[PDB]
Design a protein around this nucleic acid. Structure first.
Lengths: 45, 217, 119, 116, 170, 99
RNA sequence: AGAGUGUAGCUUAAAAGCACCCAACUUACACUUAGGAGAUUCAAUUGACGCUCUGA
């Protein structure tokens, strides 16, 4: 059960868009995160 | 009464990969993204997309597409590590990567004389030994590896006592932090099981009732 | 002309009426009472009643309260009762189902306010 | 009245408690105050998971002192939520921690660190 | 000089050492419920009340409501809160089922039993219907406890009731 | 230090004119309603499952401590003793793609 | 194999009332408001269907 606290929404009302940008830190490990300017993937060098 | 003093352990693998979603959770997630968009408040990404092409229409009447295209192709560059090393193997029961989204439980054959039983891994304890220390000794004994597990407490989880000389069987619950599980093709018969094969591999009442303290999720 | 119990000023609700409309919203059922000061229930209408229950979708919603308001009001016109007091809690006052209940009662023929005592 | 049998029928201040180390004495053992830090790159998953933790704790009869949040950091931004807990059992330490383990959505980490 | 209480004191059994382990009235409404229940209980001190006081049915009913909630317009109308209720069906079926107990309440409230029979209560099983002629067009009905003028009641009324001898009395 | 970050950024005031348009249809709100209804069904079934697990496992460990108490009266005293290894206890959340 | 048995979670409730879940206000909880799902194991007080405990 890793999907309960995932079905979310921004509970604020003074918020801009967020976009499900897949992030990798260094390990080829993708996580869906919401960030400004709809990126599709990330890597921290 | 001479008690055959038996300790044991029930080993857990925490899933590194998340579970897939319900289709109802799919429709609800899509709905939350729609209604989440509906109440947002002027993201600068669209301010650098919507009004900019309006101003370019004003300049032509008298780049966001490149950013999206680069993000799309760079999305096409890095392939995803596949969440399924599960159906291709299909018989690597000894391997730690048999499943990724569920819990995995250690489970070892034991050959006795009066019995011959496929058992959740045990040990034999001494009154001097701590029960937690019995399970700590149980960790790096039977597998013959360099794992790194983790317990929680000296509280047990599931007790089953069978006789034929008195006896008792105590079931703890550990949790694998990491594993330097050297030479996974052992001579031992450790098998990692999700939940369903525990009702397959383990028939009797002292073993068909382990799943009521296995974290089923 | 009859006395109302004038007193009871530190305590909710006021006992100063002749007839009270008391709504009992349970988990499953909406319920509506018409009582004296005695506590003698004069006229009731619940959804725990086959005549009203079967024509409803759910026994607890705003439709249940408008229904039980029509039914309660029609039952009270034929009891010679024309004046209740309804005293809600300030959240039950601003609920939709009790505004709908009150609109059902007033449109039904019952004034939810008693005439004063003539001294 | 002080001499009647109904004396003190109206008293109520013994019914309101109008008012830290761990208590592990000899038989009845319990943790002190705790801290559960929730760090994520998402406001949504951290807040919502803190909700799920908080509603578990209210649904299992645990004193939850605070549920505050820590300030974020310039890095991407890392978000934190602190949901304090005081008082568990031996069995309830295991059973309570296994669900918080087995309910994490996506990449959000835990802490069973205590106060100070 | 203390004298000990006669029966049990209130707030005795819930009085424990760990109040913080006891779940509390989170609301106003729950306290009002429990509080009214304790008001209605018989006590030993002096109180205000001293001085100022088969299977086929559930089968067809379960299948009947189960058929009732299955229609799409009933759910869609009820969620848009424009669904209503026919008052006539409820009226006639009320005349059939539980009407007699309610007419028993109205006869007890209006003191018909303490005066008409010295307290010998009974249940009006027959759904009687009496109405007075108001000219030729319409007619004033008599329900339990109505107001009717003696001009409307100048002439003897029409009595209709569904039954099978009888003696009627006013 | 009482500095938090629930304070709203000042930029979210002026240009609030991108989406004043919120219009739907009947069947969109009908399907939205059926998602909320059947999703409360789904979530309720979930907490029935988890409550069943906490009940089952909690009774399992209490029965275990009873048997361990009645078969070893010097081990149920130490079964209650807590571990000092659970002050810095951590676990990171799951991922998608293995390294 | 025997014994205890039996309404949805609980009921010396008789198809009820509290429990329960989602949605909204809340950091969140709580309150409140809008909704949701519910049951008397099957046949004649009696037997036989499902559970628990004691057996081999």
């Amino acid at each position: 059960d890793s999907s309960r606290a995932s079905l979310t929404r921004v509970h604020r009302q003074a918020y801009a868009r967020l976009y499900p940008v897949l992030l990798v830190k260094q390990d080829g490990s993708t996580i869906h995160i919401r960030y400004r300017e709809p990126r599709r993937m990330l890597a921290m060098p | 009464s001479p008690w055959r003093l038996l300790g044991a352990l029930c080993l857990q693998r925490p899933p590194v990969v998340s579970k897939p979603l319900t289709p109802l959770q799919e429709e609800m997630a899509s709905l939350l993204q729609q209604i989440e968009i509906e109440r947002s408040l002027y993201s600068d990404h669209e301010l650098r997309a919507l009004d900019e092409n309006q101003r370019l229409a004003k300049k032509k009447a008298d780049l966001a597409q490149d950013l999206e295209d680069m993000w799309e192709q760079k999305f096409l560059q890095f392939k995803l590590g596949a969440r399924i090393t599960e159906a291709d193997e299909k018989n690597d029961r000894t391997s730690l990567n048999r499943k990724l989204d569920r819990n995995l439980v250690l489970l070892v054959r034991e050959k006795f004389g009066d019995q011959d039983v496929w058992i959740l891994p045990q040990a034999e304890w001494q009154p001097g030994e701590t029960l937690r220390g019995t399970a700590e000794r149980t960790l790096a004994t039977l597998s013959e590896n360099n794992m790194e597990a983790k317990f929680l407490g000296n509280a047990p989880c599931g007790h089953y006592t069978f006789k034929f000389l008195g006896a008792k069987v105590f079931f703890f619950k550990a949790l694998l932090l990491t594993g330097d599980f050297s030479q996974a093709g052992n001579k031992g018969h450790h098998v990692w099981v999700t939940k369903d094969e525990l009702g397959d591999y383990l028939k009797p009442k002292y073993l068909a009732q382990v799943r009521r303290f296995v974290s089923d999720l | 002309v009859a006395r109302k119990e004038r007193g009871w000023r530190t305590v909710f609700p006021s006992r100063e009426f002749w007839h009270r409309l008391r709504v009992i919203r349970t988990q499953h059922h909406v319920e509506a009472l018409v009582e004296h000061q005695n506590g003698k229930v004069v006229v009731s209408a619940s959804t725990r009643e086959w005549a009203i229950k079967k024509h409803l979708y759910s026994t607890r919603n705003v439709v249940a309260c408008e229904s039980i308001g029509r039914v309660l009001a029609q039952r009270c016109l034929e009891a010679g009762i024309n004046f209740m007091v309804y005293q809600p809690t300030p959240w039950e006052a601003a609920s939709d189902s009790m505004k709908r209940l009150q609109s059902a009662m007033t449109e039904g023929g019952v004034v939810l306010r008693e005439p004063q005592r003539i001294y | 009245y002080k001499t009647k049998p109904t004396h003190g029928i109206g008293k109520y201040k013994h019914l309101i408690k109008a008012e830290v180390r761990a208590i592990n004495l000899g038989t009845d053992y319990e943790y002190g105050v705790l801290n559960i830090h929730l760090t994520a790159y998402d406001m949504t998953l951290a807040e919502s998971y803190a909700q799920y933790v908080h509603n578990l704790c209210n649904s299992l009869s645990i004193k939850v002192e605070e549920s505050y949040a820590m300030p974020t950091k310039t890095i991407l931004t890392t978000h934190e939520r602190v949901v304090q807990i005081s008082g568990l059992s031996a069995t309830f330490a295991e059973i309570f921690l296994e669900i918080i383990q087995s309910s994490l959505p996506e990449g959000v980490r835990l802490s069973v660190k205590e106060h100070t | 000089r203390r004298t000990p209480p006669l029966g049990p004191m209130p707030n005795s059994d819930i009085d424990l050492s760990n109040l913080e382990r006891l779940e509390k009235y989170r609301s106003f409404d729950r306290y009002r419920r429990r509080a009214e229940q304790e008001a209605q209980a018989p006590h030993w001190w002096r109180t205000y009340r001293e001085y100022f006081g088969r299977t086929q049915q559930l089968l067809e009913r379960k299948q009947a409501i189960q058929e009732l909630r299955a229609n799409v317009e009933e759910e869609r109308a009820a969620r848009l809160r424009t669904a209503s209720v026919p008052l006539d069906a409820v009226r006639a079926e009320w005349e059939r089922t539980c009407g007699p107990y309610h007419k028993q309440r109205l006869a007890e409230y209006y003191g018909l039993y303490r005066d008409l029979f010295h307290g010998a209560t009974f249940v009006p099983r027959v759904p009687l219907h009496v109405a007075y002629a108001v000219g030729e067009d319409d007619l004033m009905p008599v329900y339990c406890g109505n107001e009717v003028t003696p001009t409307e009641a100048a002439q003897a009324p029409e009595v209709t009731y569904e039954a099978e001898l009888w003696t009627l009395l006013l | 230090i009482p500095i938090e970050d629930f304070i709203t950024p000042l930029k979210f005031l002026d240009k609030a004119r991108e989406r004043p348009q919120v219009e739907l249809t009947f069947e969109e709100t009908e399907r939205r309603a059926l998602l909320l209804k059947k999703w409360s069904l789904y979530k309720q079934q979930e907490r029935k499952m988890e409550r069943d697990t906490i009940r089952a496992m909690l009774e399992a460990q209490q029965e275990a401590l009873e048997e361990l108490q009645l078969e070893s009266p010097k081990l149920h005293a130490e079964a209650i003793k807590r571990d000092p290894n659970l002050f810095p206890f951590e676990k990171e959340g799951p991922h998608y793609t293995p390294p």
